[PDB]
Amino acid sequence: AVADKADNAFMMICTALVLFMTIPGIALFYGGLIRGKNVLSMLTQVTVTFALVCILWVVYGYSLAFGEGNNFFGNINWLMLKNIELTAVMGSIYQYIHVAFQGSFACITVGLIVGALAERIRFSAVLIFVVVWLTLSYIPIAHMVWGGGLLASHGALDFAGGTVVHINAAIAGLVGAYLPHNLPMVFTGTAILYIGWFGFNAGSAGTANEIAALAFVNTVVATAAAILGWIFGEWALRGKPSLLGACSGAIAGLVGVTPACGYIGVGGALIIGVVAGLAGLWGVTMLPCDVFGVFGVCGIVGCIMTGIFAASSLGGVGFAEGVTMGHQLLVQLESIAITIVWSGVVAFIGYKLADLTVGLRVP
Amino acid sequence: AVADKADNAFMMICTALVLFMTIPGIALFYGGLIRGKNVLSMLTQVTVTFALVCILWVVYGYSLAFGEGNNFFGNINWLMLKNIELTAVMGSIYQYIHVAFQGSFACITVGLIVGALAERIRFSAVLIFVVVWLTLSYIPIAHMVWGGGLLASHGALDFAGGTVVHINAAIAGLVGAYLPHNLPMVFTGTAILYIGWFGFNAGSAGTANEIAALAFVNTVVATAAAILGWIFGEWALRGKPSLLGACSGAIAGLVGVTPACGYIGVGGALIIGVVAGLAGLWGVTMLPCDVFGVFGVCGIVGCIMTGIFAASSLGGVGFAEGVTMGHQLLVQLESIAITIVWSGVVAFIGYKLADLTVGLRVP
Amino acid sequence: AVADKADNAFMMICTALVLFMTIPGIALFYGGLIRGKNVLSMLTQVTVTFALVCILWVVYGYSLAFGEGNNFFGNINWLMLKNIELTAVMGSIYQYIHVAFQGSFACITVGLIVGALAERIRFSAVLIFVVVWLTLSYIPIAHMVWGGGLLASHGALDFAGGTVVHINAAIAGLVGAYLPHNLPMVFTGTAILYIGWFGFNAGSAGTANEIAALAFVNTVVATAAAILGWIFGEWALRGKPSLLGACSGAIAGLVGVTPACGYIGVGGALIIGVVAGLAGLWGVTMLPCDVFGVFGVCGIVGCIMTGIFAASSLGGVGFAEGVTMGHQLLVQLESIAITIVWSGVVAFIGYKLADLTVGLRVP
């Protein structure tokens, strides 16, 4: 296997785009939603935890998530990237690029949780939680879905992380919750998340091919459809649209299309977008932790719908040989259930260890 | 024809850069120019109309603009991208990428109009206007210039949209007009527009070749020359430069070089930049709708100057075989005249239909 | 030599990313640090001087920095890019792209100086200073390090500009100094600088190869390590972290890894990051001109450490044949000393000429 320079270029740019989603995307998003007096502290926690994730990833994260091991975890043969030749190739790109791309996904997942909870959690407690949750929840789930683990071995479909990122973070944030003064800033963060999401979704193809092109177009379509779906629901239920509704709709479509983008047709993207936008509005209506309502509900919806719209007859790329829509749907549901329980349990353990060691609630 | 992965990568990144120009570029630009009390509403209208354009584009826009038809419109053979194989190639990239790239241009064109008029127009009225104007003005003009229609068939030169985007939007906005509290925000929007404009201009080559490189360098040069031209005029006429003047100068150069970037030499880019910056200052001095003065005047200037500076003797790539500078200038003037009348008439019809159905002026 | 389209694509995107560091990165960074009443003026000076640098670069800058000449300067054979065929290749990319990429480095270097001093300097005086300093300091130092001049001919290692950019600007700013109201804005500028820095560092490979991948990963690692190093020092010395500390730490790591990114291993990047973060904190503690403390101290630290960590035995790419670590360290020290003296003297001359002609201090 030789590296393709076009894929190397595409993937390094896509990685920078995903990093852009956390720094400063998610920080600005939450920054405009939380109380003004808590903004500085939250920005500090998001930046420091981002740094922490980057370091844990290179030290042992990548190795445990992507090394060969068992159904749940990799190995410790790639500690500090030891044994990875600089010219080593993963797919059609240099492995070092795969390390950075995969690391960027861990970063946004953690940013999603930290940005919302920073307001109520002690600084030392969040650092402890991140270490526990990244190591025991993000890493094994990434291994199970993208590292040849349990879910992948059963043929679960999740192109860019409906489970690994969205559902995983939503449950962790919701467990935390249980235990806007600047809308232009919310809009700015939403816009940065949107632009960076093209690297997130299209880069998930691992090459600048027709699947990356499909994921790109589906991202544009689902996001637009979800903005319109949310806004229509808002107009129907509240009498008028709002800026927060439009931004929430964009995020709902981005989240919903995440697991499906590289497997569905544009018709499927439009349908998923509208359904996600409406489900997202329903989610928040029920339930800054409300954000987890969108990531959680839309992630679930997206993961289920991937099991329908991947079908050739519906314009998708087609299910694997010998797999019926019925069989695929069951696999999607099982993957969702496993992600929820795994993340929830680990998050509980993380919060408890922090509370027992330094105390959870901000002093 | 086979897709080149390097071109696929370049074009997907360029598309994200153009999308970045609208979300959040143009929104922040207008956001700092309009009254504070109208900012939220404008951001909502820009986001919702952006979503609408994305959907109309995939449903029928792309097909009618880029399908084979007549001198004015394409066809309905590509509705919802039907009949476009995922592996289909357009130029040296997958057609799906061409769909997204072309769609991003429709988005910024509409954002230019909506951002300025949002303050004075009813929400439902702007949605009606967008549908009418995108369908009857943007689509046919795009077809005429870039889709093998009337203007292209007469050899009109417009590399990145001096007519299709700038003049087209300026006239529509000016028809609307007829019927700064945050300068750091204006600066931020200008900066995002500038960075995204490299995807807009260089991506217009459709490949990462020497023409993309030329357009890139010419973009840097014309923008810089226009900032200096505007600022000098401002210093001479008002006694000092201002932040708004510097930002306006950047936009004047970006607009002026848009139709010429892939056809002229760096000397030509410098001259076009200075002339555009000064013409832009003159334009605003005469005439947030003042913004259309820059897009309109600089677009016209840029389109005319392309007919001069494309000449080999002036460092350009050269006019087509058998075409004199005199003949090319006439074609540029005719293209400008047609764009102005076409856009103006359609815009009038759009505003009138909205006013007759829901009422134009914000209630 | 033929151009590789993958490298052309990568390098044009990397150039836009470096331009993004100045417009609006550095402007927002300083914008949140300086007094509110001076923000507009500073943004104007950064924009106008950016334009000036772009023009001087194309007119004669590129030719004098990268043309063949002597140990200190190039030639005037490439004035306005004359004699450079559009299809001319430099390395594996079109020369026009090399012109734009190199120009973007000149821009950020000047932005670093102008953003800090704008508050205290007369507008006309800064323009005079920029012309003198860019021409007599940036150009010759760029030629000496990257244009086959004195330092390169002695085998100095500086992958992305620890000397040419960081030390060069820090000394110029400090000579100037001798002669935060919005922390969310500082954070936003820091984030943009960070994202753009991937184009700055990885693009310095000139191709989307394994060295670009290495520089990319090392950038992620050193930045994260420096954020943690600074924050730990801050917690130890002040009792708690702060947002400004976290942002300063990121910049310290970015600066420190700049000369080393394409030559060291990830272990080396982590060590350089931590040392840079701590040295940066020490620097500011001693000494908006405090920013030069970070760029100056971290640039020196990074340049020295490159001479250690490039060693094969420490995970680096290895020193050139026949070069010991001892010999390389001496070359790094000599390069640093020469950069400091050269920049300091030229800066003094620049400020003096401005003061004698129009007066330095803002009227």
* CA–CA separation, B67 and B179 (whole Å): 34
Experimentally, how was this structure solved?
A: X-ray
Query: How far does B83 lie from chain C, in Å, by closest CA?
Result: 30
Per the CB < 8 A criterion, the answer to whether C29 and C42 are in contact is no
User: Any idea what the Cα angle at residue C358 is, between residues C356 and C359, rounded to 5°?
Assistant: 70
The answer to whether the beta carbons of residues C66 and C143 sit under 8 Å apart is yes
Instruction: Provide the annotated binding site of B for NH4(+).
Output: 204
- Measured distance CA(C93)–CA(C8) in Å, rounded: 5
Give the annotated binding-site residues of C.
Answer: 204
Q: Does B89 touch chain A (CB under 8 A)?
A: no
Whether B183 and C40 lie within 8 Å, measured CB to CB = yes
C267 contacts A55? CB cut-off 8 A? no
Separation in Å, CA of C322 to nearest CA in chain A = 23
The angle at the Cα of A265, spanning A261 to A269, to the nearest 5 degrees, equals: 60
Give, in order, the Cα–Cα distances in Å from A117 to each of A187, A347, C246.
20, 13, 19
- H or E element, residue C176: helix C168-178
Q: Which residues of C are annotated as a binding site for NH4(+)?
A: 204
Q: Is the dihedral of CA C326, C328, C331, C333 positive or negative?
A: negative
SS3 assignment, position B121: strand
Instruction: Determine contact: B194 vs chain C, CB below 8 A.
Output: yes
Torsion, CA A60, CA A63, CA A66, CA A72, rounded to 10: -70
Please confirm whether the linkage preceding A363 is cis (ω < 30° from 0): no
Q: Is A240 helix (H, G, I), strand (E, B) or coil?
A: coil
Q: In chain A, what are the domains?
A: 1-363 (1.10.3430.10)
Minimal CA separation from B208 to chain C, in Å = 5
Decide: B96 and A216 in contact? Cβ < 8 Å.
yes
Please compute Rg for chain A using Cα positions: 19
Strand partners, A94: A89
Residue with tokens 């800026």: A243
The CA distances from residue A21 to A142, B138, B343, in Å, are: 19, 32, 37
Count interface pairs B-C at CB distance under 8 A.
142
Q: Least CB-CB distance to A51: which of C10, C207, C224?
A: C224
Nearest to A215 by CA among A249, A259, A250: A259
Q: C305 with C226: CB under 8 angstroms?
A: no
> Phi first, then psi: what are they for C361, rounded to 5°?
-60, 130
Alpha-carbon distance A249 to B321, whole Å?
Answer: 52
| Structure tokens belonging to residue C250 | 């990121």
CB contact under 8 A, B86 and A209: no
Instruction: Please give the Cα distance from A170 to A165 (Å, whole number).
Output: 8
B94 neighbourhood in chain A, CB within 8 Å: 209-210, 213
Per residue, the 3-state secondary structure of chain B, as one string, reads CCCCHHHHHHHHHHHHHHHHHHHHHHHHHHHHHCCHHHHHHHHHHHHHHHHHHHHHHHHHHHHHHHCCCCCCCCCCCCHHHCCCCCCCEECCEEHHHHHHHHHHHHHHHHHHHHHHHCCCECHHHHHHHHHHHHHHHHHHHHHHHHCCCCCHHHCCCCCCCHHHHHHHHHHHHHHHHHCCCCHHHHHHHHHHHHHHHHHHHHHHHCCCCHHHHHHHHHHHHHHHHHHHHHHHHHHHHHCCCCHHHHHHHHHHHHHHHCCCCCCCCHHHHHHHHHHHHHHHHHHHHCCCCCHHHHHHHHHHHHHHHHHHHCCHHHCCCCCCCCCCHHHHHHHHHHHHHHHHHHHHHHHHHHHHHHHHHCCCECC
Instruction: Answer for the pair B49, B111: CB distance below 8 angstroms, yes or no.
Output: yes
The rounded distance, in Å, linking the Cα atoms of B49 and B132 is 12
Q: Do B209 and C28 touch (CB under 8 A)?
A: no
Is some CB atom of chain A closer than 8 A to the CB atom of B79?
A: no
Check if A362 contacts C (Cβ < 8 Å). no
Residue that has been written with the tokens 């509980």 in this structure = A348
Contacts of C123 in chain B (CB under 8 A): 240-241
Three-state secondary-structure class, residue B94: strand
According to DSSP, residue C361 is labeled: B
C4–B9 C-beta distance less than 8 A: no
Q: Which residues are CB-neighbours of B218 under 8 A, at least 6 positions away?
A: B201, B257, B260, B261, B262, B264, B266, B268, B269
> CA-CA distance, A254 to B6, in Å (whole number)?
26
CB contact under 8 A, B217 and C19: no
Closest residue of chain B to C192, computed from CA coordinates: B192
Containing A341, the helix (H) or strand (E) segment is: helix A325-357
Q: Where is B178: in which H helix or E strand?
A: helix B168-178
Tally Cβ neighbours within 10 Å of residue B318: 12
What are the structure tokens assigned to C279, written together?
């040295």
> Could you tell me whether strands C93-94 and B93-94 are parallel, antiparallel, or unpaired per DSSP bridges?
unpaired
Interface contact B86-A214, CB threshold 8 A: yes
Asked if residue B237 lies in contact with residue B215, where contact means CB atoms within 8 angstroms, the answer is no
Using an 8 Å CB-CB cutoff, list chain C residues near B10. 5, 8-9, 12-13
Q: Do B6 and A208 touch (CB under 8 A)?
A: yes
| Torsion of Cα atoms, C27 then B25 then C93 then C152, to 10° | 10
Compute the distance between CA of residue B16 and CA of residue B100 in angstroms, rounded to an integer. 9
CA torsion sign for B231, B236, B240, B242 is: negative
Residues of chain A contacting B34 with CB distance shorter than 8 Å: none
3-class secondary-structure state, position B361: strand
Residue type at A116?
A: A
What is the Cβ-side half-sphere exposure of residue B308, based on CA atoms within 13 angstroms? Answer: 12
Q: Which is it for the CA torsion A152, A154, A158, A161, positive or negative?
A: negative
**Secondary structure class of A130 (helix, strand, coil):** helix
Q: Do B16 and A195 form a contact (C-beta atoms < 8 A)? A: yes
Q: Return the structure tokens found at B60.
A: 């029928």
> Which parts of chain A are beta strand (E)?
89-90, 93-94
Measured in degrees and rounded to the nearest 5, phi and psi for residue B236 equal -70, -40
| Spatial distance between the Cα atoms of C244 and B5, rounded to a whole number of angstroms | 42
Distances (CA, A) of C273 to A321, C167, C287: 49, 17, 21
Q: Which chains touch A (3 or more CB pairs under 8 A)?
A: B, C
User: In which residue are the tokens 């990799």 written?
Assistant: A74
CA-CA distances (angstroms) from residue A353 to A51, A107, A118, A129? 21, 22, 17, 8
Residue C277 phi/psi, 5-degree rounding, is -60, -45
Residues 128-187 of B with CB under 8 A from A: 185
